């Protein structure tokens, strides 16, 4: 998700943001969360072929 990608960014490995999470400021939507789950299934391209 976008908040998961900010948590892996170099800004949150810095000292004043080590104990912060990007979900705490703006939480991901359920449409954002279900699309992050839907994208994880399609990262296997064989599964994306059999789905399509």
């Amino acid at each position: 998700t976008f908040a998961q990608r900010l948590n892996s960014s170099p800004a949150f490995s810095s000292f004043l943001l080590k104990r912060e999470k990007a979900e705490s400021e703006v939480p991901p939507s359920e449409l954002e969360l279900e699309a992050a789950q839907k994208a994880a299934e399609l990262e296997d391209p064989e599964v994306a072929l059999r789905t399509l």
Binding site: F2, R5, L6, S8, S9, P10
Partner: protein, 102 residues
């Protein structure tokens, strides 16, 4: 399979920018993936027009602002229209959008 490489390069490039832009995308990878966009953006800073989109916002020029963004990404269609111009040249034709009344 005729023009699949250009259409999937645009998809591959924009999906990598949109995944990483504003988060961890380096400026070197942006200038690698789109060298002509960085060339056009660097022209504005060189010619003292670094605030030109702010200038178009000041005068309410929404159609010129849409023309500004489209002309700065106009090289995305250049691999296609150099291909379609060479296709019409091998078949003896003239290219359609290259002509004034065509």
């Amino acid at each position: 399979e005729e023009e699949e490489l250009w259409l999937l390069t645009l998809t591959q490039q924009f999906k990598h920018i949109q995944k990483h832009f504003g988060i961890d995308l380096p400026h070197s990878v942006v200038a690698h993936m789109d060298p002509l966009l960085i060339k056009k953006i660097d022209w504005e800073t060189t010619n003292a027009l670094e605030d030109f989109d702010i200038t178009l916002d000041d005068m309410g020029a929404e159609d010129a602002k849409e023309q500004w963004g489209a002309e700065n990404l106009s090289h995305h269609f250049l691999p296609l229209i150099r291909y379609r111009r060479d296709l019409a040249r091998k078949n003896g034709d003239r290219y359609g959008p290259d002509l004034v009344n065509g």
